[PDB]
């Protein structure tokens, strides 16, 4: 009844990012979601979790020189998204082939043998939700798992198995 | 002119290597070696490392739809080398940036909680030695681990702990 | 395998194309696109691109020697596509290592110093979606240019820089 | 921006179309598509196509006062599908009760006494076809003549006779 309808996430600012350095675009709507794990350590309050993206980000930005968190969004065991590169810019996430025609969301733990809580699942449903909402991606869109596109053991075999129930999930 | 016998890789055909269908050559003298892990099952068997480097292999070509394995070389906790792509193909292992400047090598297992045993420690020293003599490699090439140029735990933090204290190691 | 009709193809009886000697089949799916320019004279009306498809084959077949037109489609600058070898059949486009294991496209002009119009592109990358349906190509298949694969000026240096920027383009 | 949308559509600019001022949208998966002849001028090359879409729409615009010309798609005897109203706004094609529930797709022409070429009818399959893989059609989507919907020769003897034996023709 009024446009603006979904979901909730954790700002740059307020997770204190790096200022990113990409300017790759992608192309809106996109067709796919590919689903990872950080396989780091996990958090579960917005406290833990924020201070987990920096780390991540550290990590993709320090270490590996890239111009900002790989990911477009990353998942937190608190029951929040937070903001990475989000609907419009090309992530580093899932190798050249994937990156600029997904979207790429990341839990933040190691989901091998543990499965991330309903908050999680629903924060990054809700997510998904809203970039359909928003045109960001196709209705149609597509969710793969991370090892479904590159060789890895990511998202994990607990969360990977609940993304194959999923509605969009297409191998 | 030095063509010496420092090879004692298996080849493709003797682990029944589907063919391949990657044509990309890397330009030796080839100056990185990255080292990953397949993060999956070890095998200490020449019997059992063949039918791994099919199995690995199968998932790169098979699920992932790739030409080859990703790997240049793969390394069995049999201690044997199992040709990959080899010297002479690009491979898909590091991302975009890595991949046409590196050799891949990887370990079969995975080596987080475990280390290789000593045979396969030798056996990878042995081809990076051999892949110097042949002039595939750089003379004073630099080993990178996997985790140093992309997002992964690969090689594993026990392999990648190994790694770092070698002389052809460069941060 | 899947019955769905996609594109519009001139078939070759529409062109009045000689019959194909032709009995070399590709292997399903094809992971390999290069698209070539035939460096012949171009046509914009579907008239006289019949009669240069015509005209390439002529050559090919009664010059050159070959069982029918190299290529395995052709495109035209009025903006249709027409059929030349097919999807299932072998071509002669792109020497000895490249012929058996891609699918040629041309387009029919010399595209040194110009491009081919935004009809002729469309129907390229539109017929490479339907090869994907039919399950002709791979899903993942990547397009070189005939120079990625070949010492030629072909596709032309304009047409070159355009195919340089489509999704599945792969150097 | 990524790859150009199926069907090989000539879009609205290409054939220097008038701005639309139309609003409405179809819901989709649109059930019903109408087939129709212009009862103009038939046209058999690109330029003289994009200009018989520029006369139609200049009619329908100008003098009778539509937000833009009525059809969604055009087909032309070059063989090439002219972008008109669109796979998601409503037509102004086949009266206000298939208007709302159908894509109405035009040949440039009458076919009282002449048929459109196998290029023109190709082209509007792999409309058909194009609209079904968006999802603007749905896959079970019914073909009606203009003549089945309002009381018309359109699309006249010669092509109506042609539509009825369209596997997705519907009496
Ligand atoms: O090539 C553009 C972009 O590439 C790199 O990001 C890569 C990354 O290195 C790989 O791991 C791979 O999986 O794909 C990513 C993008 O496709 C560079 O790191 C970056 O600096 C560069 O702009
Ligand atoms: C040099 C390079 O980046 N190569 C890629 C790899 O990252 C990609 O995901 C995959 C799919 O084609 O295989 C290789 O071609």
Redesign the interface.
Known sequence: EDPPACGSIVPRREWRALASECRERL?RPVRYVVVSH??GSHCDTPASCAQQAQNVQS??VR??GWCDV?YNFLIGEDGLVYEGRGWNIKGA?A???WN??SIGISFMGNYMNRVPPPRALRAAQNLLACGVALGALR??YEVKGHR??????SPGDRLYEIIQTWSHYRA
Chains 1, 2, 3, 4 share one sequence.
């Open positions: 192309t950080t396989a990590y993709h270490n590996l790989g996430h190798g050249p082939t600029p025609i209705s149609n479904d596109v590159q060789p890895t053991l």
